[PDB]
Design a protein around this ligand. Structure first.
Ligand SMILES: Nc1ncnc2c1ncn2[C@@H]1O[C@H](COP(=O)(O)OP(=O)(O)NP(=O)(O)O)[C@@H](O)[C@H]1O
Ligand SMILES: Nc1nc2c(ncn2[C@@H]2O[C@H](COP(=O)(O)OP(=O)(O)O)[C@@H](O)[C@H]2O)c(=O)[nH]1
Ligand SMILES: [Mg+2]
Lengths: 425, 336
């Protein structure tokens, strides 16, 4: 009825899909060996959303996990997050494309989609209503941006009636591998924007700027930043198995968050902002985190919310708390700041309270915003791309790999049109 | 006082099978443009145009009589004034050199009715029969060399090895060459047909009669009963540099003559530029081919006519710019 087939690819897709499962298996309280040990019926009726069925409180958690190089496939099968899922979804490749978007899309990456699409054709006929396709990948890599963007088109031309969202990861100059990728970026955005519905804009330019200043983690790893992004991805999908006053299914989330005919890159906020297990924090009071959702710093996308006029401000609350104070503290913003949220929607969505607390936080929150502050994550990519391109530098890594020189020009001009589309004030 | 002409040759049948692109255009009477494909640093290919201006330029549809009429035909009213005159055939190998000089390549045979040797030896005799010049009572005699492995051979006699000596008046004299006395034009065609049958040439599939030696044909104009020399017309068919892709089946014998063709032309390339600047010691005695060609450059009564031969295609664009640049340097020469 309300079934979800999940898919992910790439190193960043696989270094968060393990982090995605460990958070939701402790907020729902799921045993990592395959079983379940919980108490509430809030966490028990909704077991058919992601998961299959088997006897003895066991199942197979279906999510297509694929990359060509076998070093990543052997790194997400070690721990208790390894034996949780189906071994027949072990879909790997022969030769990993070395951060080449071209080999992951046309020459080599367009070979083993038939070993991926055959898995999706069997996880579709077993369900009864498929209510989405989710995707986690990096926007500037190899098969994470090559194969992960191609598998959208192979399913969208076969299941066009399904709302598709992608958990996007913009790259950054500070945390960087295969140092130059505005070529890998805008080729991965151009086929994304033309083929998706919802797009969560996560960048490593803001996930490193917070840790340099607020959390004081000056030199972290990917896994320290994988912890930050895996806390929001449970704060988003808590409106899928924990119902409330805002029954906020993904198709209903699609209609309630997309004003203009083209998709836009969502800029989520966060709860009070620490790492795992860190003390020295106050009680998570409701009127305090209103300033922590509308902060100019607490954003999961490096932007400027003081200038970006709000369009959709749907923020999901989690934890047993007072319903009266939630309704009052939101009215200290639109009734005082007419430029931050502006006049497009009468009675815009501003709350959805969940009672089940996350694993480690009591009375937390999850801000999900969308505004014209996402100009600056289009101008900083394009200015780093137009310096790459008006001298035709590093052009020969794609032209000998079955590409076209003038496909850059559309994907350049498609991004410049987005910025001029955002000055609708 | 050297006239320079150029002749683009047409494209063969085998070069159409390998899909060869023609880059040499002769749009006007005395111009030529080389279309050179070049790529920039960012793999953006562009095209260069190398203009040239000569005394006369030949198309690819011109026949050997038209090439004759503008090169060696004006030089017959010079040999009957006391001077001497030569003509070269300078270019890449396979570029139609012995097709112009020797004759039209009729497969297994050599149709010597064409060529510059026969058409001028005919035109000496018509000039000799005019009543203005019949009064001098001259005797036309013909000789015919071969320069192989740096040494001079002979082709009228079968294999007479020849020496290159010098008179006290600074005049090179090959001695002792065979100098038969020519009766008429039916006699001089018997020399050339017998001459080309004995010229040393390789045997392969691409160029089954490729030149392997620098053949020199002379027509000596002598007064009767004096044993002086009143005029000479010395033809020169070269062998042509070959260093592009000549790696087919070359044994120790093939590159023995192979590196000696290229050695003889570098000596010829240097004497052009040494005559270009002034007062330098003109290296005429490096190769014996340059010692024969001494009287062509610094002759006080010498009127030469170099015919620069050009292969048309794309793969020979490198040799083409090499060959055309020397002929422009040959044109810009003032000896005395
Ligand atoms: N103007 C022309 N028209 C038609 N065919 C030509 C022309 N010039 C040359 N050829 C042909 O080109 C082929 C090779 O010509 P050739 O005269 O041997 O070149 P080459 O430079 O003298 N090679 P080599 O003898 O070693 O110097 C022969 O089949 C000729 O008939
Ligand atoms: N934030 C974050 N970014 C990552 C992670 N892993 C990879 N990336 C980004 O993804 C890019 C590399 O893409 P990758 O998946 O390795 O390419 P592929 O393996 O050839 O498909 C780098 O620029 C990183 O910025 C991760 O765990 N966290
Ligand atoms: Mg020849």
């Amino acid at each position: 009825m309300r079934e979800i087939v999940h898919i992910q690819a790439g190193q960043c897709g696989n270094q968060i899909g393990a982090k995605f499962w460990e958070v939701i298996s402790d907020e729902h309280g799921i045993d990592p060996t395959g079983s379940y040990h919980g108490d509430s019926d809030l966490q028990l009726e909704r077991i058919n959303v992601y998961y299959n069925e088997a006897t003895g409180n066991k199942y197979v958690p279906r999510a297509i996990l694929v990359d060509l190089e076998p070093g990543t496939m052997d790194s997400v099968r070690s721990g208790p997050f390894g034996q949780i899922f189906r071994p027949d979804n072990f879909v790997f490749g022969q030769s990993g494309a070395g951060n080449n978007w071209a080999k992951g899309h046309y020459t080599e990456g367009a070979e083993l989609v038939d070993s991926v699409l055959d898995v999706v054709r069997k996880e579709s006929e077993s369900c009864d209503c498929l209510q989405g396709f989710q995707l986690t990948h990096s926007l500037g890599g190899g098969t994470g941006s090559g194969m992960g963007t191609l598998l959208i088109s192979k399913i969208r031309e076969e299941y066009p009636d399904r709302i598709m969202n992608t958990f996007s990861v913009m790259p950054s100059p500070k945390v960087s591998d295969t140092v130059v990728e505005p070529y890998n970026a805008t080729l991965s955005v151009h086929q994304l924007v033309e083929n998706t519905d919802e797009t969560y804009c996560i960048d490593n330019e803001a996930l490193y700027d917070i840790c340099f200043r607020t959390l004081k983690l000056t030199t972290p790893t990917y896994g320290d930043l994988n912890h930050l992004v895996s806390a929001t991805m449970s704060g988003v999908t808590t409106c899928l198995r924990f119902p409330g006053q805002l029954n906020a299914d993904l198709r209903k989330l699609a209609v309630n968050m997309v004003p203009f005919p083209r998709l836009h890159f969502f800029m989520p906020g966060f709860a009070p902002l620490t790492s795992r297990g860190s003390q020295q924090y106050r009680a998570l009071t409701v009127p305090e985190l209103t300033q922590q959702m509308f902060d100019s710093k607490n954003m999961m996308a490096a932007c400027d919310p003081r200038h970006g006029r709000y369009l959709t401000v749907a923020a999901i609350f989690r934890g047993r708390m007072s319903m009266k104070e939630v309704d009052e503290q939101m009215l200290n913003v639109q009734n005082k700041n007419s430029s931050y949220f502006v006049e497009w929607i009468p009675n815009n969505v501003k709350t959805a309270v969940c009672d089940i607390p996350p694993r480690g936080l009591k009375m937390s929150a999850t801000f999900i915003g969308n505004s014209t502050a996402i100009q600056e994550l289009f101008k900083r990519i394009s200015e780093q791309f137009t310096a790459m391109f008006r001298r035709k530098a590093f052009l020969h890594w794609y032209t000998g790999e079955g590409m076209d020189e003038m496909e850059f020009t559309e994907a350049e001009s498609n991004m410049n049109d987005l910025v001029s589309e955002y000055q609708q004030y | 006082s050297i006239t320079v002409c150029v002749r683009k040759r047409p494209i063969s049948r085998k070069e159409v099978n390998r899909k060869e692109i023609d880059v040499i255009s002769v749009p006007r009477k005395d111009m030529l443009i080389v279309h050179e494909p070049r790529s920039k640093v960012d793999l953006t290919k562009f095209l260069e145009n190398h203009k040239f201006r000569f005394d006369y330029a030949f198309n690819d549809t011109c026949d050997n009589a038209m090439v004759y009429k503008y090169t060696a035909k004006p030089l017959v009213k010079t040999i009957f004034e006391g001077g001497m005159a030569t003509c070269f055939a300078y270019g890449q190998t396979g570029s139609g050199k012995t097709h112009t000089m020797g004759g039209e390549f009729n497969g297994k045979v050599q149709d010597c009715k064409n060529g510059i040797y026969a058409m001028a030896a005919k035109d000496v005799f018509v000039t000799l029969n005019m009543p203005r010049y019949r009064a001098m009572n001259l005797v036309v005699s013909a000789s015919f060399f071969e320069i192989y492995s740096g040494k001079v051979f002979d082709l009228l006699s079968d294999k007479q090895k020849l020496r290159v000596l010098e008179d006290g008046k600074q005049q090179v004299q090959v001695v002792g060459l065979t100098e038969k006395v020519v009766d008429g034009v039916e006699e001089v065609l018997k020399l050339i047909q017998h001459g080309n049958a004995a010229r040393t040439s390789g045997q392969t599939s691409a160029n089954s009669n490729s030149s392997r030696s620098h053949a020199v044909f002379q027509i000596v104009l002598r007064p009767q009963g004096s044993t002086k020399i009143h005029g000479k017309f010395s033809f020169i068919d070269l062998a042509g540099n070959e260093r592009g892709v000549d790696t087919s089946s070359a044994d120790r014998q093939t590159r023995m003559e192979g590196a000696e063709i290229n050695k003889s032309l570098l000596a010829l390339k240097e004497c052009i530029r040494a005559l270009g600047k002034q007062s330098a010691h003109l290296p005429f005695r490096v190769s014996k081919l340059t010692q024969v060609l001494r009287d062509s450059f610094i002759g006080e009564k010498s009127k030469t006519c170099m015919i620069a031969m050009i292969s048309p295609g794309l793969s020979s664009c490198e040799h083409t710019l090499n060959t055309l640049r020397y002929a422009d340097r040959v044109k810009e020469l003032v000896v005395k």
